[PDB]
Design an enzyme around this catalytic site. Sequence first.
Site, PDB file in Angstrom:
ATOM      1  N   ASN A  50       0.761  -1.229   0.000  1.00 59.35           N
ATOM      2  CA  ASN A  50       0.000   0.000   0.000  1.00 59.35           C
ATOM      3  C   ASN A  50       0.805   1.302   0.000  1.00 59.35           C
ATOM      4  O   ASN A  50       0.265   2.348  -0.363  1.00 59.35           O
ATOM      5  CB  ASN A  50      -1.004  -0.024   1.141  1.00 59.35           C
ATOM      6  CG  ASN A  50      -2.148  -1.009   0.867  1.00 59.35           C
ATOM      7  OD1 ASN A  50      -2.817  -0.962  -0.204  1.00 59.35           O
ATOM      8  ND2 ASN A  50      -2.385  -1.907   1.813  1.00 59.35           N
ATOM      9  N   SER A  51       2.092   1.232   0.351  1.00 55.08           N
ATOM     10  CA  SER A  51       2.934   2.425   0.348  1.00 55.08           C
ATOM     11  C   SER A  51       4.272   2.342  -0.434  1.00 55.08           C
ATOM     12  O   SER A  51       4.820   3.365  -0.864  1.00 55.08           O
ATOM     13  CB  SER A  51       3.213   2.829   1.804  1.00 55.08           C
ATOM     14  OG  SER A  51       2.039   3.287   2.447  1.00 55.08           O
ATOM     15  N   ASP A  54       1.167 -11.129   1.157  1.00 60.10           N
ATOM     16  CA  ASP A  54       2.435 -10.766   1.821  1.00 60.10           C
ATOM     17  C   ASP A  54       2.775 -11.616   3.054  1.00 60.10           C
ATOM     18  O   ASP A  54       3.915 -12.011   3.260  1.00 60.10           O
ATOM     19  CB  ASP A  54       2.466  -9.276   2.148  1.00 60.10           C
ATOM     20  CG  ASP A  54       1.323  -8.842   3.039  1.00 60.10           C
ATOM     21  OD1 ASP A  54       0.209  -9.477   3.113  1.00 60.10           O
ATOM     22  OD2 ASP A  54       1.542  -7.802   3.683  1.00 60.10           O
TER      23      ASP A  54
END
Lengths: 199, 192
Positions: free
Chosen positions: A8-9, A71
């Site tokens: 997400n980042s 993940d």
Amino acid sequence: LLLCDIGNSNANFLDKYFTLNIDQFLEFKNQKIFYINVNEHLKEHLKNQKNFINLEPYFLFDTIYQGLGIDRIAACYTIEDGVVVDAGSAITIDIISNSIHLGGFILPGIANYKKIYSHISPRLFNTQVSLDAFPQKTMDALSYGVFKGIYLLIKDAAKKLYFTGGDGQFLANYFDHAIYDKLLIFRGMKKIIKENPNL
Amino acid sequence: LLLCDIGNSNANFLDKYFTLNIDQFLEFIFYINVNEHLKEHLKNQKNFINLEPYFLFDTIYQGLGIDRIAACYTIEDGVVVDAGSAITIDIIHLGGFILPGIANYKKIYSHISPFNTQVSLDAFPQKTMDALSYGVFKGIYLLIKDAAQNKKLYFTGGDGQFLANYFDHAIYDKLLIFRGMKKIIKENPNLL
């Protein structure tokens, strides 16, 4: 052998390890890239990049945890027995026994604990705070709350410990019989490729 | 005799217990206050009398908040847990530690990803909401347990009874704070 672990980042790459942010990632061009992705926002984009090759479908992993993140799967994947802790933006703790995923849980990441204290009050870390004495100042009262909370949850859940992520080494140091491996996830990805060489 | 324990999310009153949220309190008396952004407004109000400078409390802890002092003020021996915006855990004063309140755990998660209170604590979760709920509840549980390594245990605060249920040998007292506040008016008859 270019691998990509997309969050997400950040997208973390291995060739040689590097990190791009999401803007950077969107402008990247390259050769085959093998990937996993938890970013729901990047699914269309990835499908449009023909050089990008999703490893997620190849992961066979025995769990009943609904919607487990790829993940976490990839970081548990090279582990037969043990507790897996990925300490980044979030802290996820997963329990493996006999190549079976027994369950797992989630904590805020350390930076996020720091943000919420601030949102609560301007009156509200010491990384070298002691865990075996009560704190005597507010800096330490916070650092203890956070770090000891994670220490006890992990102690209770653990079995050998494996640690990964930006904050993993720091957390590992509170434990004996624990390893820190920055590359846990890329090892799961490596394993997928050694298991389907037709990739 | 009207008492106010003004916190970071709520104003607990005792006239008859009852609580306002801050945005309410603003449109609404001996008091303690930990709300920074409320310092100004309170000085403005002449019916409000601050009680903080009357407490005298021995502690080796520097800059202990007045809510912790007040909660702890009538306890000779034990662990004192106050669960609100934050959760303060104090030892009788030999020190103490702070966590975010349960709703503020919610807020980090809700912002990242736009609780199950009956979650089991003795099994590993297998869905996201349970994974979250257990990190929160068991984290708090393990910290208090470890700190209360056999001592007495006291809980107060808006979320304090919930947390007390996790324990055998533990007491919840909704009013522990006003009990410090009354003991102060006691020690200082001049206040009336």
